Write an enzyme that holds these catalytic residues in place. Structure first.
Site, PDB file in Angstrom:
ATOM      1  N   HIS A  96       1.293   3.894  -2.964  1.00 36.48           N
ATOM      2  CA  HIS A  96       1.424   5.349  -2.964  1.00 36.48           C
ATOM      3  C   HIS A  96       2.635   5.761  -3.804  1.00 36.48           C
ATOM      4  O   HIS A  96       2.481   6.501  -4.771  1.00 36.48           O
ATOM      5  CB  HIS A  96       1.559   5.860  -1.528  1.00 36.48           C
ATOM      6  CG  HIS A  96       0.267   5.898  -0.764  1.00 36.48           C
ATOM      7  ND1 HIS A  96      -0.910   6.386  -1.308  1.00 36.48           N
ATOM      8  CD2 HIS A  96      -0.028   5.536   0.511  1.00 36.48           C
ATOM      9  CE1 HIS A  96      -1.867   6.340  -0.394  1.00 36.48           C
ATOM     10  NE2 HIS A  96      -1.370   5.799   0.710  1.00 36.48           N
TER      11      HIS A  96
ATOM     12  N   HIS B 265       0.814  -1.220   0.000  1.00 33.89           N
ATOM     13  CA  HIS B 265       0.000   0.000   0.000  1.00 33.89           C
ATOM     14  C   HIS B 265       0.850   1.274   0.000  1.00 33.89           C
ATOM     15  O   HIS B 265       0.566   2.221  -0.728  1.00 33.89           O
ATOM     16  CB  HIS B 265      -0.858  -0.100   1.267  1.00 33.89           C
ATOM     17  CG  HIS B 265      -1.622   1.129   1.631  1.00 33.89           C
ATOM     18  ND1 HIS B 265      -3.002   1.137   1.703  1.00 33.89           N
ATOM     19  CD2 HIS B 265      -1.213   2.358   2.033  1.00 33.89           C
ATOM     20  CE1 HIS B 265      -3.413   2.326   2.103  1.00 33.89           C
ATOM     21  NE2 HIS B 265      -2.347   3.082   2.315  1.00 33.89           N
ATOM     22  N   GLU B 266       1.886   1.300   0.837  1.00 36.78           N
ATOM     23  CA  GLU B 266       2.871   2.388   0.824  1.00 36.78           C
ATOM     24  C   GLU B 266       3.624   2.444  -0.486  1.00 36.78           C
ATOM     25  O   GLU B 266       3.766   3.501  -1.079  1.00 36.78           O
ATOM     26  CB  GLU B 266       3.854   2.212   1.979  1.00 36.78           C
ATOM     27  CG  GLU B 266       3.197   2.338   3.333  1.00 36.78           C
ATOM     28  CD  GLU B 266       2.179   3.475   3.354  1.00 36.78           C
ATOM     29  OE1 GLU B 266       2.424   4.516   2.701  1.00 36.78           O
ATOM     30  OE2 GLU B 266       1.132   3.319   4.015  1.00 36.78           O
TER      31      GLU B 266
ATOM     32  N   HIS C  99      -5.602   6.963  -1.991  1.00 34.61           N
ATOM     33  CA  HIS C  99      -6.581   6.044  -1.389  1.00 34.61           C
ATOM     34  C   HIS C  99      -7.819   5.915  -2.252  1.00 34.61           C
ATOM     35  O   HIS C  99      -8.205   6.863  -2.915  1.00 34.61           O
ATOM     36  CB  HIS C  99      -7.003   6.490   0.006  1.00 34.61           C
ATOM     37  CG  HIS C  99      -5.885   6.507   0.999  1.00 34.61           C
ATOM     38  ND1 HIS C  99      -5.828   7.408   2.038  1.00 34.61           N
ATOM     39  CD2 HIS C  99      -4.779   5.732   1.111  1.00 34.61           C
ATOM     40  CE1 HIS C  99      -4.741   7.182   2.758  1.00 34.61           C
ATOM     41  NE2 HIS C  99      -4.097   6.162   2.223  1.00 34.61           N
TER      42      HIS C  99
END
Ligand SMILES: CC#CCOc1ccc(S(=O)(=O)N2CCSC(C)(C)[C@@H]2C(=O)NO)cc1
Ligand SMILES: [Zn+2]
EC number: 3.4.24.86
Length: 259
Positions: free
Chosen positions: A193, A189-190, A199
């Site tokens: 990004h 998820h990081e 999101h």
């Protein structure tokens, strides 16, 4: 069609003295193996993701350099470091302010950071508000500072060039080690990004499905459990952003996949 020579984001992975102690049991090999394994499972998700829902696949992440900080960086008065022993700005907290840690880490890792697609920090710090990880959001723009592909910006205060091709993950939350499957998803998820995704819009059904349809996708704004089908996958919303970014940035800083 993907470039076999330009298909992989090579990582600098840092385990600071906290992760080393509490996740790696004070053992360098253990710490190294843990993160080789972690990144390898995160790579399965990326590599197997079709960003255009067809043949734009095979893109992943590999460690170029692992660095294990067996020891804290000693600090005298009026000076800070990401791998320093104490937390910043509050001494009497388990953890740093997450945004300040990312900032610190990026400044300290600047010389290394310029040599790699992405730099990632692994730590074991209980951030307030159940926060688990943080990273700069990439973009297809050449001038973008943030996410995949190093791009210098001069810090007058820092007296040097900095690179915001960075992010971090903590495996500590509410006073405990998170699950291995949770840790994999924090890093996915990081790095998501870093790869250009914001999101998921939580009220958009296509990108934030109900449990019965497989649950939320990994860029959901509230930590997913990893119990549901979609939790380890990228939404269409995430795909469209990451696709554009890869499409532009792979030629710039992606390398060949190594054995
Ligand atoms: C388990 C799991 C998972 C998916 O990855 C996540 C990583 C961090 C967060 S977070 O630390 O809880 N959080 C959400 C609110 S906005 C804020 C910045 C606080 C942060 C985030 O999105 N970091 O990328 C949530 C999920
Ligand atoms: Zn996030």
């Amino acid at each position: 069609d993907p470039d076999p020579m330009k298909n992989t984001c090579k990582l600098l992975v840092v385990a600071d003295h906290r992760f080393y102690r509490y996740m790696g049991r004070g053992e360098e090999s253990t710490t190294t193996n843990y993160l080789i394994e972690l990144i390898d499972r995160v790579d399965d998700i990326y590599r197997n993701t079709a960003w255009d829902n067809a043949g734009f696949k095979g893109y992943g992440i590999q460690i170029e350099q692992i660095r294990i900080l067996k020891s804290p960086q000693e600090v005298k008065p009026g000076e800070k470091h990401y791998n320093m022993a104490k937390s910043y700005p509050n001494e009497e907290k388990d953890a740093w302010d997450v945004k300040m840690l990312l900032e610190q880490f990026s400044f300290d890792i600047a010389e290394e950071a310029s040599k790699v697609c992405l730099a990632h920090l692994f730590t074991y710090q209980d951030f307030d508000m159940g926060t688990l990880g943080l990273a700069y959001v990439g973009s297809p723009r050449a001038n973008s500072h943030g996410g995949v592909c190093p791009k210098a910006y001069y810090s007058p205060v820092g007296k040097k060039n900095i690179y915001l091709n960075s992010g971090l993950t903590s495996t500590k939350n509410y006073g405990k080690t998170i699950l291995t499957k949770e840790a994999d998803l924090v890093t996915t998820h990081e790095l998501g990004h870093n790869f250009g995704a914001e999101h998921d819009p939580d009220g958009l059904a296509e990108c934030a499905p109900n449990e019965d349809q497989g649950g939320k996708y990994v860029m959901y704004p509230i930590a997913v459990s990893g119990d549901h089908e979609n939790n380890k996958m990228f939404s269409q919303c995430s795909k469209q952003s990451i696709y554009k970014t890869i499409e532009s940035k792979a030629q710039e800083c992606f390398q060949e996949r190594s054995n």
